[PDB]
């Protein structure tokens, strides 16, 4: 085992200390070479699209009920920014040289990136969920732009506090984890329990709550487009707003459903990458571990994890 102590210990594979190898960690070398182009070629362009939104935002009576979109854009802007470490340095310190080599829990060479990626990833989801609640108010309630803004400190409290505590709960006795050569410090890439408990579950609960209240908002407006006929001109004028919510919600809920699918795939897969490592390790290399999903699944994993923030552009471009 290329580790013997945290030079917890550093114990990953059912042991006092060990660490899975950095090259050919899971997959074939070839696909890493084109991920080296592709992860950036999608992430930096997604970041370029997302930064324009914040640029326009920094410049229609009030923005109180559309406010969470700004912080959504900021959050996934940062997510894309620190995925841009995919080929930014053209060095891979986060897989430290032979030094906590694979990835160092409780050492600087990894922690400086997980605490931002996980934090902003959770923050963006909470921003979308409370954007759903923001639209829930002033759709079925009788609440105004100023009245909803009066809860803004509670909204910021929840939105920046849930990610804060979910990070606070990942010190020595908890799980800060590594990355592939195409990756940056993040939790759960090698440990299934970290994924199952403190990644997959929050995303699922957020998406569920959003669907709940998003539908109980859109079809709560449904009772108004018809069933009060005196000012027709808004029909197919307020339609632009409803259809914009719908398009935004599709373009958001697609990637999260897909990534939850990918994590459910890994929660039923990684159990066999190991049970056969007893038969691919003890040398260099159920009957096979991975297949064509060697890219076509873990590639759309990162693709959807980055294009969660794309709804911002088709939201802002429909209001000009």
């Amino acid at each position, epitope marked *: 085992c290329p580790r013997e102590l945290k030079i917890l210990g550093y114990s990953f594979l059912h042991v006092r200390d060990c660490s899975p190898p950095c090259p050919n960690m899971y997959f074939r070398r070839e696909e890493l070479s084109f991920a080296r182009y592709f992860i950036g070629l999608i992430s930096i362009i997604c970041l370029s699209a997302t930064l324009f939104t914040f640029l326009t935002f920094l410049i229609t*009576r009030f923005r109180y*009920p559309e406010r969470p979109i700004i912080f959504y854009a900021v959050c996934y802007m940062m997510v894309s920014l620190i995925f841009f470490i995919g080929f930014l340095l053209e060095d891979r310190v986060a897989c430290n040289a032979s030094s906590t080599v694979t990835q160092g829990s409780h050492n600087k060479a990894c922690t400086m990136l997980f605490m931002i990626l996980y934090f902003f990833t959770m923050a963006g989801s909470v921003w979308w969920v409370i954007l759903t609640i923001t639209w829930f108010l002033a759709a079925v309630p009788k609440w*105004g*732009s*100023e*009245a909803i803004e009066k809860k803004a400190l509670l909204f910021h409290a929840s939105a920046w506090g849930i990610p804060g505590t979910l990070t606070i709960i990942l010190l020595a006795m908890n799980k800060i984890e590594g990355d592939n050569i195409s990756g940056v410090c993040f939790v759960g890439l090698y440990d299934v329990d970290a994924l199952r408990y403190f990644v997959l579950a929050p995303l699922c609960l957020y998406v569920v709550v959003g669907v709940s209240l998003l539908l109980a908002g859109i079809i709560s407006l449904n009772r108004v487009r018809i069933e*009060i006929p005196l000012e027709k001109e*808004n029909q197919d004028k307020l339609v632009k*707003f409803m259809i914009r919510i719908g398009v935004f919600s599709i373009l958001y809920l697609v990637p999260l459903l897909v990534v939850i699918g990918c994590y459910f795939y890994e929660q039923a897969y990684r159990g066999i990458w190991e049970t056969t490592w007893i038969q691919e390790r003890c040398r260099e290399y159920q009957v096979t571990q991975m297949s064509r999903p060697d890219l076509i699944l873990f590639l759309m994993k990162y693709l959807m994890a980055l294009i969660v923030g794309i709804p911002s552009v088709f939201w802002v471009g429909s209001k000009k």
Partner: nanobody
Amino acid sequence: QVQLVESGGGLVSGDSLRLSCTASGRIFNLDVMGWYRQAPGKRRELVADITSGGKINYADSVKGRFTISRDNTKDTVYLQMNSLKPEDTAVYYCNAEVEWLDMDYWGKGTQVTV
């Protein structure tokens, strides 16, 4: 809804003058609701906006002369035009808005003369 509170202006106020507007056909929370003029001229200009209890905003050439208020259980915006001189001659329009949906409500039927 507006009511015509008119006589001819004062017929050249006497001691004061007020307008009222009131909305009973509503769905969403009227955020900003106020008044607009027209000379009769090529434009319809702003007078005074209220934003549900705050941010009263008078006209950039007329500020510091009028007053505006609002009730909330009854969606009534008021405008008292004290120290009135003729160039206030205009057919006035009460206005209301909901922001996020971008729906604008206009009333009809009020005129002041001198």
